[PDB]
């Protein structure tokens, strides 16, 4: 019962986070646009969800999907103290699928990387990362390095900017451009 209660609390927290830090225009459009505010909001929401995700007692799988967590808790309870016979043990899955709340949560999972990573690779974007926290980290590191110089000065700032770094100099052993890409998530 406590695990089910924690799962419900986690789902409520995820809904509150979604309403508090909505992604304007859709997650895919925000990722494609790659705006600093959108990346920051997505990373903040993801990190808050990660921090708030509970640790249940009866399950050793820390599911990041509230749908999966709630469904597994319900299935465990049903198996433990709701199955009269083999027919019930088989109809457990139909019972789970017939719940309206699970139906609603079914269409609220995170976007898998492969939806856009191959498209970005085809376009030719090397300063990119499907992971919102990683993208925020890259942008923030670049901004910190630019600020370090912000104090012939615009030229130095542009030189320190990540986009203006030669590709040949990334690794000594491969003095050729367009050889390194973005790590897949």
């Amino acid at each position: 019962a406590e695990d089910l209660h924690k799962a419900e609390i986690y789902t409520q927290t995820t809904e509150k986070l979604e309403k508090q830090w909505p992604a304007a225009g859709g997650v895919a459009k925000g990722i494609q646009g790659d705006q600093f505010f959108d990346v920051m909001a997505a990373a903040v929401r993801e990190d808050l969800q990660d921090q708030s995700r509970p640790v249940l007692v009866n399950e050793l799988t820390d599911h990041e999907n509230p749908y999966c967590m709630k469904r597994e808790a319900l299935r465990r309870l049903v198996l433990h103290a709701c199955t009269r016979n083999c027919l019930d043990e088989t109809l457990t899955d139909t019972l789970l699928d017939r719940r309206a709340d699970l139906q609603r949560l079914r269409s609220k999972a995170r976007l898998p990387p492969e939806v856009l990573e191959p498209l970005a690779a085809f376009v030719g974007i090397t300063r990119f990362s499907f992971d919102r926290r990683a993208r925020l980290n890259q942008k923030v590191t670049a901004v910190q390095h630019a600020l370090r110089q912000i104090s012939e000065k615009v030229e130095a700032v542009l030189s320190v900017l990540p986009e203006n770094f030669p590709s040949d100099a990334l690794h000594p052993h491969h003095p050729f451009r367009n050889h390194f890409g973005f790590e897949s998530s």
Binding site: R84, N85, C86, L87
Partner: protein, 59 residues
């Protein structure tokens, strides 16, 4: 056969043009469901139904 496969019942059945007989074993709830199906959920002319040799609590 479909009903028994769904209900995990065991035993045997024997159907012909005008009659049917069978010996069914399984959980009490499954047996009750089978009895209800035979009494009310058969898509053929069922003029008479009879149940006999009922036993419970078998190991």
């Amino acid at each position: 056969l479909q009903v028994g496969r769904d209900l995990f019942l065991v035993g045997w059945v024997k159907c012909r043009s005008r009659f049917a007989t069978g010996h069914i074993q399984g959980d009490v709830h499954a047996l009750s469901y089978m009895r209800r199906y035979l009494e009310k959920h058969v898509d053929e002319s069922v003029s008479s139904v009879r149940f006999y040799e009922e036993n419970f609590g078998m190991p």
